[PDB]
Amino acid sequence: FQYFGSYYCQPGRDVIVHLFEWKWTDIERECQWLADHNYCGVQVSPPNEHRIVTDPPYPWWQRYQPVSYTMNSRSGSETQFRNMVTTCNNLGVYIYVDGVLNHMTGGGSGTGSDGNSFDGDSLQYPGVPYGPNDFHGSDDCSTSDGEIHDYNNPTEVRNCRLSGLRDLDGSANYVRDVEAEFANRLIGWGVAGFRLDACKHMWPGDLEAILGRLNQLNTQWFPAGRNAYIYQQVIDLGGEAVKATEYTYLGRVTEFKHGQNLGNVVRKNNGQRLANLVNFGEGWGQLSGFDALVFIDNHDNQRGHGAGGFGTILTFFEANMYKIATAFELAWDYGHVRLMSSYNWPRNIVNGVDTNDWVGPPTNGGGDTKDVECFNGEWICEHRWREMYNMVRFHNVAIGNPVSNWWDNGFQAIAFGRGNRGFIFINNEDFAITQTLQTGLPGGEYCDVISCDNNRPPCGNSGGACRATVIVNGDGTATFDVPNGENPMIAIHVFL
Ligand SMILES: OC[C@H]1O[C@H](O[C@H]2[C@H](O)[C@@H](O)[C@@H](O[C@H]3[C@H](O)[C@@H](O)[C@@H](O[C@H]4[C@H](O)[C@@H](O)[C@@H](O[C@H]5[C@H](O)[C@@H](O)[C@@H](O[C@H]6[C@H](O)[C@@H](O)[C@@H](O)O[C@@H]6CO)O[C@@H]5CO)O[C@@H]4CO)O[C@@H]3CO)O[C@@H]2CO)[C@H](O)[C@@H](O)[C@@H]1O
Ligand SMILES: OC[C@H]1O[C@H](O[C@H]2[C@H](O)[C@@H](O)[C@@H](O[C@H]3[C@H](O)[C@@H](O)[C@@H](O[C@H]4[C@H](O)[C@@H](O)[C@@H](O)O[C@@H]4CO)O[C@@H]3CO)O[C@@H]2CO)[C@H](O)[C@@H](O)[C@@H]1O
């Protein structure tokens, strides 16, 4: 039985970006920028035919209610999808499909994004086709409303309806065949892998049966005999009967503890200290790095969906702390890193819940999506922020080097290197620090890539606040002058 947790990237590329609700034409155009900045790939929103919800008007979450496995979605047509995949693959930037296999729609009836009808009440999905026999039901789920309530009951979690979403019978050969045909069609077009939605709600044995039906990647671009890359969404913050460790034998698993812990640390919640990150990773009770897909925030928890709440996870709304957490995550050596890329919406937290957590992407009406224009107040484009992409370059130069030359002052300042390739100093204190440290880097003149454009003089001041150059002495020490406040961190590194 094959393992699907290994990704495939061009040399010098590694980090993934979730281009949440981006249209295919925009992702196709973005792949040139992503390749130039040595990102490895893109997670795309569910591309199959999905529900069109008009009350409320065209929420993002309509794409998590499949109507069929045809390929006309809010992000564009099948033609536009295949154009995107071909162009991106040709640039060495790969595509990971948000694959929604646990369920179809909730209740009610309507027309999906490709003109096929559905009826959640009668369990009729003629575009597939699925009927009542293809779903779990009262024989499989004994809760009074048929929905999931008790996360200490694995059978309930896996056989009942997640928030009323009609729950497919993943044990049936027909459903396994239909879902593998969908995945294999995507793979045949050049898709490199999948973010598998709601895997906590599916039996690992059913996922194993589906994955065992997959074809290997398309050799127009990928090496012969290469399994697709599979990472599985399982929210495991402890204290439940379904565990992430149940899924790691199939592929990687989303490590939600990672963003919870880094959010709490950088926020200094309940007396947390940055110095505690000295052993961050598996030693914090998390998955092994090889098993983990890691990220500061995702499309659910930036808007309170999933575990819930707004006092821990860091997002673009907390931009300064968010950059600190992401910089640490990119400079560290733990997990496959995914960066969220968001759109703005009128987040309105009332009694701990965002009342507008349903709002979809920038739109002119009718359920369309507007062309991306980064930094216009509608598209956030975190992956295009200099502090992000320069730390992606830092991360790339550092690939294969362990953490070295760790230093901490005991509280909210840390520093560490990656072999002889890069060094970062993070000052999360409310004061300024002047500290000479062994960097492990060759002597020379370096630029702070958090504030400057380049890694060596001329440093480049496109952001307007490029700091004075950092001198690494012949002995490898450098004196770091890091004021507290905005971007309170200095990162330096060598060239490839
Ligand atoms: O139709 C009848 C039906 O109406 C109501 O339900 C509807 C609901 O109000 C409406 O918002 C929508 O549901 C959305 C959902 O709100 C969105 O979040 C989105 O859900 C997908 C999500 O984006 C995915 O990333 C993925 O995340 C899931 C996890 O896989 C789950 O495990 C679960 O996390 C739980 C976690 O595991 C636990 O440890 C604990 O922390 O609690 C968490 C749950 O709070 O939830 C997350 C986040 O949703 O999977 C989701 C599904 O793909 O998209 C949904 C579909 O559009 O549609 C509902 C159906 O109409 C009403 O509430 C029902 O009672 C009623 O039967
Ligand atoms: O070439 C395009 C642009 O490049 C340069 O802009 C950079 C910035 O120098 C970076 O600092 C960063 O900008 C982020 C910023 O770090 C982040 O804090 C956030 O700022 C928001 C803020 O959250 C919000 O409160 C409010 O004040 O609006 C700010 C943004 O206007 O988001 C910024 C990105 O929008 O990344 C950009 C792009 O790399 C250069 O300075 C620009 O002149 C240039 O157009």
Ligand SMILES: [Ca+2]
């Ligand atoms: Ca299920």
Ligand SMILES: [Cl-]
């Ligand atoms: Cl996810």
